[PDB]
């Protein structure tokens, strides 16, 4: 589901939280990129098991299925962490809770009539093109 | 507390909440938006307030158990839709 | 109907044929009624009274003159056409109730009594004790007010079907 690399930077600062502060890690956004001279080698090594660099309908449907898989796995991880913090095994991480609050704030409303009408309009346009 | 399904708060609701008659819920919501506590708009013609955000804060164990329940539901829905799509498209998945 | 040629004409036949037609009316089997009419001779439907009377009753009923079909109780060609008229009365009241169902938003008790012919007013609760469209006799009976979500799962099923038919090698 995810990349093989997790990045951490050691930050030690007085917790504005007001809690005892200990020198611990903080996650850093990570990505996989390649030089061109490394892209050539990577592609050559993967030539036999490579996928098409184009969206073929079967592969696009498969990509959507994999997206659903990833979303389910992430939601399961969050639910397990919530279980643990609720029961008491782990402490309440305020940044985690803030981000979860923002996520639930960000969930859309799909039963709205003004949205249902636009959705049906766009679906009909796409279906007439099809 | 209000879920995104029916986050349309009403003037009467805010009146039954912190004690004020419905002639300054408008000003109170204006102050909230200006300070940055919430986001959205106020349709005072229909006498309701649309909230599309809240400033997150720190919560309680029960407030997190509620979030756990909501997740449980969301995970169930995602898994059901995943199974449906996978079974339906089984013959074209690469 | 089978051995018409060999057997002779039965003068005591059309009475029973009309009796069966009236029974079909009463049971509300209109399709069978019309198949029976088609089986019958074309001339008889007009020349005769025994067959014509059930034909006229069904004609009134399907035209919608419920008052006329009620008034047509008296003209019974023979006494045999009895208690079938009563089952037909029950069926007529059921049909009127179906009209009230599919139409007539917000109907009242007095007009309902006048239209859907009930028994004595003390028995006016009939068909509300049995058919009972959760009437809720709110004085006016409200007709119980008897009479927005994306079907995303179904639409996704259809779209995946399109993708399947496009991607299958055949």
From Swiss-Prot, chain A:
Lineage of source species: Eukaryota, Metazoa, Chordata, Craniata, Vertebrata
Recorded family membership: Belongs to the peptidase M67A family.
Residues making up the signal peptide according to the UniProt record: none
Miscellaneous note of the record: Does not bind a metal ion.
Name of the featured protein: 26S proteasome non-ATPase regulatory subunit 7
Subunit comment: Component of the 19S proteasome regulatory particle complex. The 26S proteasome consists of a 20S core particle (CP) and two 19S regulatory subunits (RP). The regulatory particle is made of a lid composed of 9 subunits including PSMD7, a base containing 6 ATPases and few additional components. Within the complex, PSMD7 interacts with subunit PSMD4 through their respective MPN domain. Interacts with TRIM5.
Protein encoded by which gene: PSMD7
Glycyl lysine isopeptide (Lys-Gly) (interchain with G-Cter in ubiquitin), cross-linked positions: 50
The species this protein was found in: Homo sapiens (Human)
PTM sites of type N6-acetyllysine: 74, 84
Function, in words: Component of the 26S proteasome, a multiprotein complex involved in the ATP-dependent degradation of ubiquitinated proteins. This complex plays a key role in the maintenance of protein homeostasis by removing misfolded or damaged proteins, which could impair cellular functions, and by removing proteins whose functions are no longer required. Therefore, the proteasome participates in numerous cellular processes, including cell cycle progression, apoptosis, or DNA damage repair.
From Swiss-Prot, chain B:
Record key words, sorted: Acetylation, Proteasome
GO CC aspect terms: cytosol; extracellular region; ficolin-1-rich granule lumen; membrane; nucleoplasm; nucleus; proteasome accessory complex; proteasome complex
GO annotation, biological process: meiosis I; proteasome-mediated ubiquitin-dependent protein catabolic process; ubiquitin-dependent protein catabolic process
Subunit structure: Component of the 19S proteasome regulatory particle complex. The 26S proteasome consists of a 20S core particle (CP) and two 19S regulatory subunits (RP). The regulatory particle is made of a lid composed of 9 subunits including PSMD13, a base containing 6 ATPases and few additional components.
Modified residues (N6-acetyllysine): 16
The UniProt record lists the keyword Transferase: no
GO molecular function, one term: structural molecule activity
Functional summary from the UniProt entry: Component of the 26S proteasome, a multiprotein complex involved in the ATP-dependent degradation of ubiquitinated proteins. This complex plays a key role in the maintenance of protein homeostasis by removing misfolded or damaged proteins, which could impair cellular functions, and by removing proteins whose functions are no longer required. Therefore, the proteasome participates in numerous cellular processes, including cell cycle progression, apoptosis, or DNA damage repair.
Organism taxonomic ancestry: Eukaryota, Metazoa, Chordata, Craniata, Vertebrata
Name this protein carries in UniProt: 26S proteasome non-ATPase regulatory subunit 13
Top-level taxon of origin: Eukaryota
Included stretch of the parent chain: 283 to 376 of 376
UniProtKB/Swiss-Prot annotation, chain C:
Covalent link location (Glycyl lysine isopeptide (Lys-Gly) (interchain with G-Cter in SUMO2)): 122
Origin: domain of life: Eukaryota
Disulphide-bridged cysteine pairs: none
Domain PCI: 1-151
Protein role: Component of the 26S proteasome, a multiprotein complex involved in the ATP-dependent degradation of ubiquitinated proteins. This complex plays a key role in the maintenance of protein homeostasis by removing misfolded or damaged proteins, which could impair cellular functions, and by removing proteins whose functions are no longer required. Therefore, the proteasome participates in numerous cellular processes, including cell cycle progression, apoptosis, or DNA damage repair.
Subunit and interaction comment: Component of the 19S proteasome regulatory particle complex. The 26S proteasome consists of a 20S core particle (CP) and two 19S regulatory subunits (RP). The regulatory particle is made of a lid composed of 9 subunits including PSMD8, a base containing 6 ATPases and few additional components. Interacts with DDI2. Interacts with TASOR.
Family: Belongs to the proteasome subunit S14 family.
Protein name from the UniProt record: 26S proteasome non-ATPase regulatory subunit 8
């Amino acid at each position: 589901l995810g990349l093989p690399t997790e990045a951490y930077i050691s930050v030690e600062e007085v917790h504005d939280d007001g809690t005892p502060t200990s020198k611990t890690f903080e996650h850093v956004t990570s990505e996989i990129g390649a030089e061109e001279a490394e892209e050539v080698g990577v592609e050559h090594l993967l030539r036999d098991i490579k996928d098409t660099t184009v969206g073929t309908l079967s592969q696009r449907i498969t990509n959507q299925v994999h997206g659903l898989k990833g979303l389910n796995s992430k939601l399961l991880d969050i639910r397990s962490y919530l279980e643990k913090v609720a029961t008491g095994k782990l402490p309440i991480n305020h940044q985690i809770i803030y981000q979860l609050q923002d996520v639930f704030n960000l969930l859309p409303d799909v039963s709205l009539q003004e949205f249902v009408k636009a959705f049906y309009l766009k679906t009909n346009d796409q279906m007439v093109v099809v | 507390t209000r879920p995104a399904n029916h986050r349309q708060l009403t003037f009467e609701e805010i009146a039954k909440s912190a004690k004020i008659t419905v002639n300054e819920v408008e000003l109170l919501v204006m102050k909230a938006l200006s300070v940055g506590l919430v986001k959205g708009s106020i349709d005072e013609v229909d006498k309701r307030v649309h909230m599309t955000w809240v400033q997150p804060r720190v919560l309680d164990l029960q407030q997190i158990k509620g979030m756990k329940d909501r997740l449980e539901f969301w995970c169930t829905d995602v898994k059901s839709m995943e199974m449906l799509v996978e079974h339906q498209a089984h013959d074209i998945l690469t | 109907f089978d051995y018409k040629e060999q057997l002779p004409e039965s003068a005591y036949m059309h009475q029973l044929l009309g009796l069966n037609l009236l029974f079909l009316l009463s049971q509300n089997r209109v399709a069978e009624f019309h198949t029976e009419l088609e089986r019958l001779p074309a001339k008889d439907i007009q020349t005769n009274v025994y067959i014509k009377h059930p034909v006229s009753l069904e004609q009134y009923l399907m035209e919608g003159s419920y008052n006329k079909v009620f008034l047509a109780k008296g003209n019974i060609p023979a006494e045999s056409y009895t208690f079938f008229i009563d089952i037909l009365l029950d069926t007529i009241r059921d049909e009127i109730a179906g009209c009230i169902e599919k139409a007539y938003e917000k109907i009242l008790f007095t007009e309902a009594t006048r239209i859907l012919f009930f028994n004595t007013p003390k028995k006016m609760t009939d068909y509300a004790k049995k058919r009972g469209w959760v009437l809720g006799p709110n004085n006016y009976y409200s007709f119980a007010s008897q009479q927005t979500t994306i079907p995303s799962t179904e639409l996704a099923k259809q779209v995946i079907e399109y993708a399947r038919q496009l991607e299958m090698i055949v």
